[PDB]
């Protein structure tokens, strides 16, 4: 019992007296905003995957050139459909900013400011500002885009391509847009600062992310990283000519200390693709940072990795053991408890996987923004380009072994979890239904009883709106013989049914949203103590219901390592010097080849897991980026790297067993005699090739590879060469 609790009990004495269509509309607005986020994501993909067409176009060295017109004609033919995408992008961001700001103005009205906003919608608005950040940084990076347009604009004009005043002003606007750095961000600020009290809404958004992050209200790594990115860009926007985050902090409207602690512990997270975001940058570039430097500690990082993977690996390996040991034990009708346990495991497993994937990506992310040099790595050439210094030379042998460990532990558990899906799906739906019905039919009886008794008509309507919406009475009809319905107590039993189906998305959203308004004079004031805890409890636990209901989808999102291969951002930075990066700079091959090269015994059973990273990237290029050339390049890399994989594997496998043979037959007395003469003939280090030799169908890029067959081909050829040599 805290002092605050004892004081609350005392305060209770001092206080002792001596619409549905509404939520439906909000859900409509929320749903509409989300569609725009999806649309923005499409534009983010367009930018990130946009390679220079102009560099592939033959230039006109002089006005006196034969094919001058032909080239220009073909230039328009190629770039025109692409320029259209840019027009749409310009139009989208313009409308998106108006849309968002219009919503901010609505929620910041003097009267509305006193109103209630759902957490889910604050999050959505949070993802909106991040969308702007992403789109702006992508636009800032892509010189290819700006140059391609100019190449089109320069060709369309020389050809006198028919264009009306509107078409001309349209082209002029696009140029100005593509030529202005930070245009999206700058426009966002202008339209926000013209709104009185806008900083109060953003404060609510930031405070919510701080609360979620602190209380672990997230499942997937992307969800975890989104919270931080919102905090950052949020404070940045809240720090302008009309608002001041430090004075906001003084009034305790926000807690800069917590945010500072979060940024210090986790400094870099993915922004989009291989393009990362250094969280502390938002702080350092804020309008009032210079005069308030001493307030921060996350602004100091250095070229030193903050955490020791060795300490992290010990814990990870422990958790892998502890959880999988228990899970493996769970592989006529069950009881509620038995279904709940499987429910808990499914969640715990997803959370564990998320932690691991987060570890890998966060390490990789930090490395990308902190490329090494000669001072940190003696073997690192001073002429080595940034990307190679960010990947290849930026990992020690032990670091590369550890990463493959985590990657293997992730993919390994993912397989077990997947095999458990059918059982999970059933146990989860049973648990969510039971929890929902037990809460709505029984738990809500007391609160409803008091609302009716004390004429809390507003609360009653909400409680009844909830029960009416989801309740599934055993008799098909509600119990009209209920005393709490009249406001009186019980001298009473209700039989709650058990179905294996979760509530509809609308049912769950409405229930949570309505419960949220109760624990938000406020309605919360008119509620007893114990009942508020009950509502808060169910509201907290029901946060993961949607994730669990969509177990299959959630599982993949907790094991996403597809970004290790993509490097369009760094490609863009080479200014045409690189059409791609060699395989020695490619993470998947860096991690895989390292095991093949060192022949590390403890890692030999892990090597296929690092190779599997190509599947993740291939699938992502085909289903998310939706670009053919990206897959062509992944496939071409796998094609090259897999041949090397077979060669090196077969090579060391034959040598290993040849040495074993020579060692097994070497005279024992001779060994001892050589030892006694300080010339010990060293024994062969044991290894672990058996599992690799047993692989009969390796799934890679859709193909089924018989690794055993390929190795046999090489090993057989080695046997013949040995015999041929001896003779």
């Amino acid at each position: 019992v805290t002092l605050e609790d004892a004081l609350s009990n005392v305060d209770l004495l001092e206080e002792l007296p001596l619409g549905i269509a509404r939520y439906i509309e909000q859900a409509t607005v929320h749903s509409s905003m989300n569609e725009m986020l999806e649309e923005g994501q499409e534009y983010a993909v367009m930018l990130y995957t946009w390679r220079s067409c102009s560099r592939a176009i033959p230039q006109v060295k002089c006005n006196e050139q034969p094919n001058r017109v032909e080239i220009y004609e073909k230039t328009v033919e190629v770039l025109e459909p692409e320029v259209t995408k840019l027009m749409n992008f310009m139009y989208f961001q313009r409308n998106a900013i108006e849309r968002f700001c219009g919503e901010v103005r609505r929620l910041c009205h003097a009267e509305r400011r006193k109103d209630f906003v759902s957490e889910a919608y604050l999050i959505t608005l949070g993802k909106f500002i991040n969308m702007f950040a992403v789109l702006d940084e992508l636009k800032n990076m892509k010189c290819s885009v700006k140059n391609d347009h100019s190449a089109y604009k320069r060709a369309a004009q020389f050809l006198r391509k028919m264009a009306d005043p509107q078409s001309i002003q349209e082209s002029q606007n696009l140029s100005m847009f593509l030529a202005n750095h930070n245009k999206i961000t700058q426009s966002l600020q202008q339209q926000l600062e013209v709104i009185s009290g806008y900083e109060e809404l953003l404060a609510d958004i930031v405070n919510l992310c701080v609360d979620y992050y602190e209380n672990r209200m997230y499942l997937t790594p992307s969800e975890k990283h989104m919270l931080l990115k919102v905090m950052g860009f949020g404070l940045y926007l809240m720090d302008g000519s009309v608002s001041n985050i430090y004075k906001l902090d003084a009034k305790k409207r926000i807690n800069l200390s917590k945010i500072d602690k979060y940024f210090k512990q986790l400094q870099v997270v993915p922004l989009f693709g291989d393009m990362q975001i250094e969280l502390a940058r938002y702080i350092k570039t804020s309008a009032h940072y210079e005069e308030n430097k001493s307030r921060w500690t996350c602004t100091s990082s250095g070229s030193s990795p903050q955490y020791n993977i060795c300490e992290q690996m010990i814990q990870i390996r422990e958790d892998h053991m502890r959880f999988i040991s228990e899970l493996a034990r769970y592989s006529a009708q069950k009881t509620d408890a038995e279904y709940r346990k499987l429910f808990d495991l499914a969640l715990q497993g997803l959370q564990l996987l998320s932690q691991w994937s987060a570890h890998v990506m966060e390490v990789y992310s930090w490395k990308l923004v902190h490329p090494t040099d000669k001072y940190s790595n003696k073997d690192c050439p001073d002429s080595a380009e940034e990307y190679e210094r960010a990947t290849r030379y930026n990992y020690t042998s032990e670091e590369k072994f550890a990463l493959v460990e985590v990657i293997a532990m992730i993919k390994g558990l993912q397989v077990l979890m997947g095999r458990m899906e059918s059982v999970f799906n059933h146990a989860i739906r049973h648990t969510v239904y039971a929890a929902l019905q037990d809460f709505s039919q029984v738990t809500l009886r007391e609160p409803l009883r008091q609302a009716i008794k004390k004429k809390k008509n507003v609360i009653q309507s909400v409680l009844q709106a909830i029960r009416k919406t989801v309740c599934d009475w055993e008799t098909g009809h509600e119990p009209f013989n209920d005393p709490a319905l009249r406001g009186e107590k019980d001298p009473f039993d209700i039989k709650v049914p058990r179905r294996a189906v979760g509530p509809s998305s609308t049912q769950l959203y409405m229930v949570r949203t309505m419960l949220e308004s109760l624990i938000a004079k406020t309605l919360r004031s008119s509620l007893e103590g114990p009942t508020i805890l009950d509502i808060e409890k169910f509201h907290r636990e029901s946060f993961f219901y949607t994730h669990l209901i969509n177990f299959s989808e959630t599982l993949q999102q907790c094991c996403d390592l597809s970004q290790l291969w993509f490097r369009e951002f760094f490609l863009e930075l080479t200014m045409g010097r690189r059409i791609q990066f060699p395989i020695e700079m490619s993470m998947p091959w860096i991690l895989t080849d390292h095991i093949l090269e060192t022949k590390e015994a403890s890692m030999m059973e892990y090597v296929l897991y690092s190779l599997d990273l190509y599947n993740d990237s291939a699938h992502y290029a085909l289903t998310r980026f939706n670009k053919q050339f990206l897959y062509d390049e992944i496939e071409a890399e796998v094609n090259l790297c897999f041949d090397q994989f077979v060669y090196k594997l077969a090579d060391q496998i034959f040598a290993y067993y040849k040495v074993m043979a020579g060692s097994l037959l070497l005279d024992k007395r001779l060994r001892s005699e050589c030892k006694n003469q300080g010339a010990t003939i060293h024994l062969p280090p044991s290894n672990r090739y058996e599992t690799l030799l047993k692989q009969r169908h390796v799934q890679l890029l859709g193909r089924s590879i018989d690794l055993n067959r390929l190795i046999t081909q090489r090993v057989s050829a080695a046997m013949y060469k040995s015999l041929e040599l001896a003779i």
């Binding site: 899906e421 059918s422 799906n425 059933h426 739906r429 009416k468 919406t469 989801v470 309740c471 599934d472 009475w473 098909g476 009809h477 509600e478 179905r499 294996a500 189906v501 509809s504 009969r696 169908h697 089924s704 018989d706 055993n708 067959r709």
Partner: protein, 67 residues
């Protein structure tokens, strides 16, 4: 009343649907694991057959003349 009734019927309707969709997923899983199981047997058959083919070519070479 007509709403409460519709909601009770919806729960029943959706459970039935969940049961069917769940079965469609068990069929899909069998298909996959069956595909993999047959891939292993085929590789094993291919492995043995290839060896037998080579062995026959070898024995023939012992009983015949050369070029």
């Amino acid at each position: 009343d007509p709403v409460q009734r519709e909601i009770h019927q919806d729960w029943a309707n959706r459970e039935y649907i969940e049961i069917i969709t769940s079965s469609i997923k068990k069929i899909a899983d069998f298909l996959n694991s069956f595909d993999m199981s047959c891939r292993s047997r085929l590789a094993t058959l291919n492995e043995k057959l290839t060896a037998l083919e080579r062995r026959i070519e070898y024995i023939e070479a012992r009983v015949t003349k050369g070029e």
